[PDB]
Structures are given as structure tokens and as C-alpha cells.
Write a protein that binds this ligand. Structure first.
Ligand SMILES: CC(=O)N[C@H]1[C@@H](OP(=O)(O)OP(=O)(O)OC[C@H]2O[C@@H](n3ccc(=O)[nH]c3=O)[C@H](O)[C@@H]2O)O[C@H](CO)[C@@H](O)[C@@H]1O[C@H](C)C(=O)O
Length: 420
């Protein structure tokens, strides 16, 4: 069981390279099940989720590997198995995305129904419902969601009653091969959705409206292939900007996308940070100042993203003043707070809200990670706390961040990966 040993009390400053969005790469990799010709993906981060996805793809008959340039070369021309097995799906519920394309292209597909997840209730009822609207027959047999359709799917109007990134993507993927036109009202607008749609369009799809709540897809018989560079990861960018914001440092993020972080950038500024945005970089200079507490309310894009909530909870815990953090996406995504309280943080939780009271300095001790995106807050806390900090179960961190120790050490942190 790997752990991080972190020695704090150091301002984080310098340059860090942002990688492609983990959550654009994942849906793009599953959407790739639709490609009848070779696919080349660049800027795909090196992290566990990608590896898990590749394992799922390979057992469907997809040949895919990252070559020495770092590019991911994929050939889905001969899929001969149509089941994403329980043993793989249980490790990453996003694999639910394998069902839509399998069903749309091969008219059948089977995926283990995701079970429980720590951060909250996460059913996939909207995905199923949406696929059923396109004409799929779906049953749940022995823990497996089984889909089938006698003929090509049929495009129709679909209003997803809840804003859902995942359901918006399952439906959009399936619609690219449906007959006629599909319309997805109340679609999630996340930048990763825009990227998947762009990726699909490069293969012959016909999607317009991605990024808005109204997506239109004109179905085609089949998709070909393409080369595609994944959109920068806004969450990784946010995380490093916060690294500077919580340590009074100055950080430059390279290869960023200007407009995917407005909510986050506005809050950093509200917190007292000076942030400079160019077309391909974002620089945050905290000018050696302590942050000013800010309220936070998570919500679907373009609002403040839940994947940046813990990072900002940390900022508030060392800020000056009181703050209210409300999480509306996942009702139980506050696991970091008590771990951060072990370090000296002050916060009270009540339902989906946390009231934090900022302190001057945290102090190191041992804490446990449990959220692949949120737990990064614990590592950052180690960087600015007094003495030593030990973050256990960092394997969670490895699913959502690539070379995190290298990038952090690159900003001046003293972090070593060890075991036992
Ligand atoms: C792989 C990936 O892209 N995962 C991301 C995506 O999860 P997702 O599940 O698809 O997004 P949702 O559908 O927008 O849903 C958010 C809310 O919607 C409810 N809902 C969703 C689908 C459904 O059928 N029924 C239904 O009720 C749901 O229960 C929740 O309350 O969006 C989240 C919010 O931005 C991210 O935190 C999450 O990152 C994670 C950490 C990670 O990288 O591992």
C-alpha cells in the first residue's frame, strides 16, 4: 500500500505542464468503440483510469496501446466481444459508457451495473432511459445491464430531466449511429462533452450544440477514425493554481485552455489571487498573501465544479474568515474535511453544507485518501503544513492525476512515494 511522505512549509511556485482532461479522454476512448478506422489520440494523461479503460477495450477485441511518443493508437475495426465484465467495471463506474456505443454499432451490449460509490448515490437510470428512448430493449440479468435492438437505433427528442454529464454522453454516443435526428434537451454543458462531440465529428458524426443544453445529432450509418488531441484538463489546472493560492506562491500552468475555468478563476480572484490568462497558459500569483475566505456552491458547468470543491475547502481552511461550502452534485463528498481537521482545520458539516473557519497554519500528521479527485487536497495540505504529513492510500490519487509527485516536486514540494 503506497503512501506519500510530505514535508511542508514551502511556497509552491514555478511551471507545470497541464495534461489532457482525464474525463474527456475516458468518454472519447469509449466512443472509440464506434470507430471503423484507426484512431490516434494525443495528450492523453498517464493515469490508472486510462489503463483500466484500455483493459476493458482490449477484452472487447479492440487493439490499443500507447506508443513511445505517448500517443494512444487504437484499432476497433474488429470488436468480437460485447460485455464489459464485473471485475473491471467495479473498479471504475464510468465504464457504463461502453454500453451506448456497443448497442449503437453492434445492436447489443452488456455492462455490469455499477454498485455503490463512497462519494454518493450514483444510479445510471438516465443512461438506460435515454438508450431505451432510442429504441434499445434493456434488462438487468444477474448484475448485468443487457441491451439489444433488432435494427438501427432511431433518433428522437430526449429531455434528460436532470443535468447529467454521463447520460448526456451515453445518449450522444448512441445517437451518432441512430436513424434520423436526435435532440438532447437539458444536456450537460461540460467542456469534456464538447471535446467528445468534436472527436466524434472528426469521424463523420454530425453533432451541433455541444457545450449548450440543446444538442442535435444527425445519425449516420457508421463512423470512421481520426487523430485527436484531448482538451486540456481544467481540474488539473485548477488544482495547480490552488497550489500557488494556498502557499502564497506563483504558478504558471502551460498548455491550458482559457475559458473552461471561469468559475474557479473568479473565486481565486475573490480570494485575493492575481490571475493572468493567455491563450495557452494561466498564471496565478498569490503575492505572498494569505487567502480571503470565499463561499462555494458546486453546480453543473459553467458553474463551480464539484471536482474543485475539496481543493477550495483547503484554501478556505487556511484563509482569513468564515466560509460556506455547499455541494449540490454529490451529497457525500466531504470525506476530506475530517482528514483536514486532523491537521488543524476547522469546519462543521450540516447536510450538504460545510461551514469553515480559516486558521493560519495546518500541522502535519497521517491522513487517508479516498477520492481520486478530491483527496488531492490532502497532499496539498501536506505541502503547507508544519512538520511531516503522511497520506495513505494514494492509489486513489493515481487514478485521477498523472505524475503528481513529479509535478508537485517541480513546484518546490518535498514529497516522496514509499510503502509500509
Ligand atoms: C468519468 C467522469 O467523467 N466522471 C465525472 C462525471 O461523473 P458522472 O457520474 O458522469 O456525472 P453526472 O451524470 O453529471 O451526475 C451528477 C449527479 O447526477 C446524478 N445522476 C447521474 C446519472 C443518472 O442516470 N442518474 C442520476 O441521478 C448523480 O447521481 C449525481 O447526483 O461528472 C462529475 C461532476 O462533474 C465528476 O465529479 C466526475 O468525476 C469523477 C469524480 C471521476 O473522475 O471519477
Amino acid at each position: 500500500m503506497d503512501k506519500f511522505r510530505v514535508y511542508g512549509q514551502s511556497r509552491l511556485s514555478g511551471s507545470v505542464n497541464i495534461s489532457g482532461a482525464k474525463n474527456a479522454a475516458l468518454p472519447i476512448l469509449f466512443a472509440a468503440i464506434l470507430a471503423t478506422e484507426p484512431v490516434k489520440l494525443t495528450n492523453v494523461p498517464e493515469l490508472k483510469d486510462i489503463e483500466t479503460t484500455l483493459k476493458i477495450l482490449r477484452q472487447l477485441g479492440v487493439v490499443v496501446d500507447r506508443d513511445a511518443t505517448g500517443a494512444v493508437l487504437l484499432d476497433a475495426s474488429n470488436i468480437n466481444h460485447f460485455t464489459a465484465p464485473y471485475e473491471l467495471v467495479k473498479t471504475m463506474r464510468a465504464s457504463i459508457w461502453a454500453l451506448a456505443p456497443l448497442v449503437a454499432r453492434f445492436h447489443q451490449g452488456q455492462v455490469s451495473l455499477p454498485g455503490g460509490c463512497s462519494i454518493g448515490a450514483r444510479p445510471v437510470d438516465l443512461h438506460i432511459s435515454g438508450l431505451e428512448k432510442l429504441g434499445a430493449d434493456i434488462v438487468l440479468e444477474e448484475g448485468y445491464v443487457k441491451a439489444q435492438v433488432s435494427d438501427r437505433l432511431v433518433g428522437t427528442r430526449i429531455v434528460i430531466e436532470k443535468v447529467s454529464v454521463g447520460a448526456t454522453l451515453s445518449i450522444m454516443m448512441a445517437a451518432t449511429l441512430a436513424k434520423g435526428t436526435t435532440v438532447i434537451e437539458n444536456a450537460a454543458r461540460e467542456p469534456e462533452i464538447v471535446d467528445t462531440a468534436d472527436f466524434l465529428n472528426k469521424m463523420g458524426a454530425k453533432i451541433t450544440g455541444a457545450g449548450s443544453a440543446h444538442i442535435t445529432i444527425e445519425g449516420v450509418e457508421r463512423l470512421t477514425g481520426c487523430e485527436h488531441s484531448v482538451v486540456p484538463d481544467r481540474i488539473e489546472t485548477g488544482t495547480f493554481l490552488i497550489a500557488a493560492a494556498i502557499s502564497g506562491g506563483c504558478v504558471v500552468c502551460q498548455n491550458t485552455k482559457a475559458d473552461t475555468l471561469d468559475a474557479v478563476i473568479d473565486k481565486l480572484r475573490e480570494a485575493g489571487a492575481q490571475v493572468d490568462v493567455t491563450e495557452n497558459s494561466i498564471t496565478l500569483d498569490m503575492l505572498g498573501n494569505r487567502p480571503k475566505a470565499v463561499n462555494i456552491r458546486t453546480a453543473p458547468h459553467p458553474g463551480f465544479p464539484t471536482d474543485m470543491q475539496a481543493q477550495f475547502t483547503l484554501l478556505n481552511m487556511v484563509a482569513e474568515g468564515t466560509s460556506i461550502i455547499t455541494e449540490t452534485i454529490f451529497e457525500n463528498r466531504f470525506m476530506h474535511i475530517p482528514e483536514l481537521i486532523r491537521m488543524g482545520g476547522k469546519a462543521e458539516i450540516e447536510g450538504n453544507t460545510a461551514v469553515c473557519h480559516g486558521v493560519e497554519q495546518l500541522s502535519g500528521t497521517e491522513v487517508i485518501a479516498t477520492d481520486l479527485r478530491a483527496s488531492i487536497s490532502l497532499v496539498l495540505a501536506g505541502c503547507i503544513a508544519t512538520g511531516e504529513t503522511i497520506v495513505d492510500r494514494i492509489y486513489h490519487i493515481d487514478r485521477g492525476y498523472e505524475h503528481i509527485e513529479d509535478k508537485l516536486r517541480g513546484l518546490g514540494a518535498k514529497i516522496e512515494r514509499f510503502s509500509g
